[PDB]
Amino acid sequence: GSSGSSGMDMKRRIHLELRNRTPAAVRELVLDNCKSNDGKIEGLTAEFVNLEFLSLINVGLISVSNLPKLPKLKKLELSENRIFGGLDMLAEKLPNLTHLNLSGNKLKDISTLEPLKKLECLKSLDLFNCEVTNLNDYRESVFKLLPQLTYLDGYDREDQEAPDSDAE
Q1: How many other CB atoms are found less than 10 A from the CB of residue 39?
Q2: Cα distance between residue 13 and residue 11, in whole Å
Q3: Taxonomically, which superkingdom?
């Protein structure tokens, strides 16, 4: 509720929130400081279809198959996760995924963004705290693979940091 409490299964928490109103009537819901089941979302329900803002950090997740079909959700905050690879389910699940943070994940290669080529909407992305960031010309090793990408690590092609307001 008011005082952030840790050590609570996803579903268990999500419930405390729904108490306000249907899970399909919500728009912004931060599911941070929660406990997932062996890295398997056992709460998030497709009902969130409406939801647009989804914050997932320090949740200790490894799988991204459970993720419900969210054709609306455009922003997906993901950090401090154990996502090594297999970012394909996101291409189909979130076909309109524009905002996606991949800083901190267990991505130590470029192939981890192979299935990301399908998504021609990804405007902004972050891959900080990753071995891939070290790879030779990593900045280019990502652009060449993902042409649709406009922003990389905050900065854009012109090497100009992203905006603050009125940002789609």
Answers
A1: 15
A2: 5
A3: Eukaryota
Instruction: List beta partners, residue 155.
Output: 152, 161
Specify the pairing of strand 151-152 against strand 155-156. Answer: antiparallel
Any idea which residue has 């071995």 for tokens? 131
Residue with tokens 């297999």: 86
Question: Which of 146, 165, 135 has its CA nearest to residue 157?
Answer: 146
What architecture is domain 1-168? Alpha-Beta Horseshoe (3.80)
Q: What is the 3-state secondary structure (H, E, C) of the chain?
A: CCCCCCCCEHHHHHHHHHCCCCCCCCCEEECCCCECECCECCCCCHHHHHCCEEEEECCCCCCCCCCCCCCCCCEEEEECCCCCCCCCHHHHHCCCCCEEECECCCCCCCHHHHHHCCCCCCCEEECCCCHHHCCCCHHHHHHCCCCCCCEECCEECCCCECCCCCCC
Q: Token digits for 131?
A: 């071995």
Obtained via which technique?
Answer: NMR
Question: 10: burial class by Cβ within 10 Å (0-12, 13-18, 19+)?
Answer: buried
Strand order in the sheet with 99-101: 28-30, 53-57, 75-79, 99-101, 124-126
User: Contact 48/70 with Cβ under 8 angstroms?
Assistant: yes
Give me the amino acid identity at 120: E
